[PDB]
Amino acid sequence: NVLKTSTLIRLVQLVVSFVSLWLTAAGFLHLLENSGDPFFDFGNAQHLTYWECLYFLMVTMSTVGFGDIFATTVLGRTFVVIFIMIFIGLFASFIPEIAEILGKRQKYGGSYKKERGKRHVVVCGYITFDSVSNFLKDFLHKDREDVDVEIVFLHKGLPGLELEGLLKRHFTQVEYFWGSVMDANDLERVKIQEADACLVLANKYCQDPDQEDAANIMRVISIKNYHSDIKVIVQLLQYHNKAYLLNIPSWDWKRGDDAVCVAELKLGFIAQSCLAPGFSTLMANLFTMRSYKPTPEMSQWQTDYMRGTGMEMYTEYLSSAFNALTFPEAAELCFSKLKLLLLAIEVRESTLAINPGPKVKIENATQGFFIAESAEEVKRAFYYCKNCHANVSDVRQIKKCKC
Amino acid sequence: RQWYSFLASSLVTFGSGLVVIIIYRIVLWLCGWMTEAKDWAGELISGQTTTGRILVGLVFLLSIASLIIYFIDASTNTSVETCLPWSSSTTQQVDLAFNVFFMIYFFIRFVAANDKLWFWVELFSFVDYFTIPPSFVAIYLDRNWLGLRFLQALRLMSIPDILTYLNVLKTSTLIRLVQLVVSFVSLWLTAAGFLHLLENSGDPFFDFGNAQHLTYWECLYFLMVTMSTVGFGDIFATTVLGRTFVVIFIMIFIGLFASFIPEIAEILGKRQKYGGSYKKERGKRHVVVCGYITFDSVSNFLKDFLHKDREDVDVEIVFLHKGLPGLELEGLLKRHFTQVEYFWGSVMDANDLERVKIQEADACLVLANKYCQDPDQED
Ligand SMILES: [Ca+2]
Ligand SMILES: [Mg+2]
Ligand SMILES: [Mg+2]
């Protein structure tokens, strides 16, 4: 019971039937040419080796027909006519079917080899050249803090040629595996217990967003069934579908699980535009990584606008020089000296406070929230020193912890 | 005479590295800066750093240049082993310089690879074992072997990856074209080199007495003539290794040729016929026409719009539509060539509106499919 699989059964039946028919036909031609024609008293004969017959029958099976060797007995020639009618159909159907069978084996098999000190993130759901290129362009963007997270895509498809190119251009830090988060063996191959997080992307342009959310909820369930403590971040297309995953036993927003509901967020951003007319644009530009890049054909308003799009929102620890300032002094100080727009702080449980009044002091090691052009800018709030840096005129000199 | 020494250096280099790996695997089984080096080497060969783009560009040039040096040495030689002091043979000096570069690149790729055992069994690692150690033995003796170095033709198969690391293949059809052509050409060139080795060396079990002195170019021609199943038999293999190689080649390469030629004919057939833009004459009015364009709608339109009972006015008609015109419509467009022009495109694209210079037209006429399934959808 060793041929357990239908493709492997078909492979062995093809190869053995083809080889045995070729070998027996070569033996028959070898008999005919070496024995000669009986009705010519065996005088008409041609001493081929078996191997010359075997070669000649492959050269005629394939319709190459060199004629370096050929049959000359009448029984040889009549056998070659019969052979041509049968074996052209055999060769011309065998070679394609073997090429299909040997072409069927999966390219992106195998498993993630977890390095000694690199964090990794598993990414799945809607994986395509578009979703992956927009994802990687932001996730790996130069304006982020330098962190050596690896990305591990897990998806059922073979990647298309454009996506294979993109995976090769990021070879050092992006890896791809054929599989599904619905299979515990595939979750082990990507070592999901050792990942920081799993990110589940959605096809925003599908025929049915309830069907797409039902698919993504079952991925969340499969991940959480495999191990409860994985941080899962999932893109949802419909708000009412969120309740179904809040009710998963092992879903916990306090452990960092989250559902990015694009319907909730969309309507929230445009609703704030009813309160402040352009605010959906102000605010949506803060949540995508982008670097300002002039081009001389831009009008003044386009350059002003585009410089504003170079901004993102960053979190960083305020230096000890901020301790016991009010939030208003800390915000005046960040804006005026550091060129950083400080707008909120994590007050130590702990709670986010946005633009808090003079009653709130900066406590030691307070995390602040800044609008700035890059993570390299906000570091200045962490390195600022009231003795060493306080007289500096140009912000590029604020550096190196001021020790 | 001495070829088994050139072959031995490729085998002992392969084997000793494989042994060091296997005993290391056993020691680490019975019992940081390494990862920083691995990532740096990986970024370098992936062309991610600027020095990586230099190294990647050098691999492209020197892989082509090494192959051209093989064509010279394969063209201008008779016996496959040949006596020649290295201080005299200029091609054998540049061949050494390229083999030193490929040795440095081999050690970089080793550093970069995740599993050293599987790395030592990659196809390009064999291309390196069968070429670099022989090229050093070609200094230690005053002779050369035109041996397994035909495998340099496989280094061309790196080109689609270089043209991916350099981000120049931006389109999936163009990626597929370059992968098809380079894989086909490199497989044909390497197969011709293998047949050239076999026929000119002769059968070893017949003491090399059975041999046939083909040029590399005769092998290259003969393999195309058998790939295509033409099989003139003006040239044919006669060594037993030659004939057994031709049997193996026929089973593989008929499927390659018979799938390559159709797929290239599809790719080169895909390019748009009615591209380009309307060249606005110095004093002729024109009208842009779009929406439902077909032989029926165009023939009824032109028969009235150009009718002899109208006043003589030299308006040109410019059809803009997404379809390739059918054979009957191509005929009608040619019969009106002086005054009717057609462009592939859509009025939904501002670039197509510019191509037909719609700002300079009198009018745009938008026709409708009166016989559609849904007239609200058509409107
Ligand atoms: Ca930025
Ligand atoms: Mg890695
Ligand atoms: Mg004209």
Residue numbers in the entry:
A (entry chain B): 214 to 561, 567 to 621
B (entry chain A): 14 to 44, 79 to 426
Give the exact sentences the study uses for this entry:
Mutant R2Q also led to active-like VSD structures, regardless of Ca2+ binding. However, R2Q VSD lacks direct coupling between S4 and S2 at residue R2-D142 as seen in the active VSD structures of R2Q and WT. Neutralization of either R2 or D142 resulted in the loss of a voltage-dependent S4-S2 coupling and reflected an increase in the activation energy to open the channel. This result suggests that the interaction between S2 and S4 plays a pivotal role in voltage sensitivity and the VSD-pore coupling. In mutant R2Q, we expected to find a configuration in which the VSDs are active, but the channel is closed since this mutation impairs the coupling to the pore. In the R1Q (apo and Ca2+-bound), R2Q (apo and Ca2+-bound), and R3Q Ca2+-bound structures the S6 gate adopts an open conformation. The resolutions attained for each mutant were as follows: for R1Q, 2.7 Å in apo and 2.9 Å in Ca2+-bound conditions; for R2Q, 3.4 Å in apo and 2.9 Å in Ca2+-bound conditions; and for R3Q, 3.6 Å in apo and 2.6 Å in Ca2+-bound conditions.
The large-conductance calcium- and voltage-activated K+ channel (BK) plays a fundamental role in establishing negative feedback loops to control the firing patterns of neurons, transmitter release, insulin secretion, and smooth muscle contraction. BK channels comprise four identical α subunits (Slo1)2,3 with seven transmembrane segments (TMD) and a large C-terminal cytosolic domain (CTD). A voltage sensing domain (VSD, segments S0–S4) and a pore-gate domain (segments S5–S6) reside in the membrane. Additionally, two homologous regulators of the conductance of K+ domains (RCK) in each subunit (RCK1 and RCK2) assemble as a tetrameric gating ring (4× CTD) and serve as the cytoplasmic Ca2+ sensor.
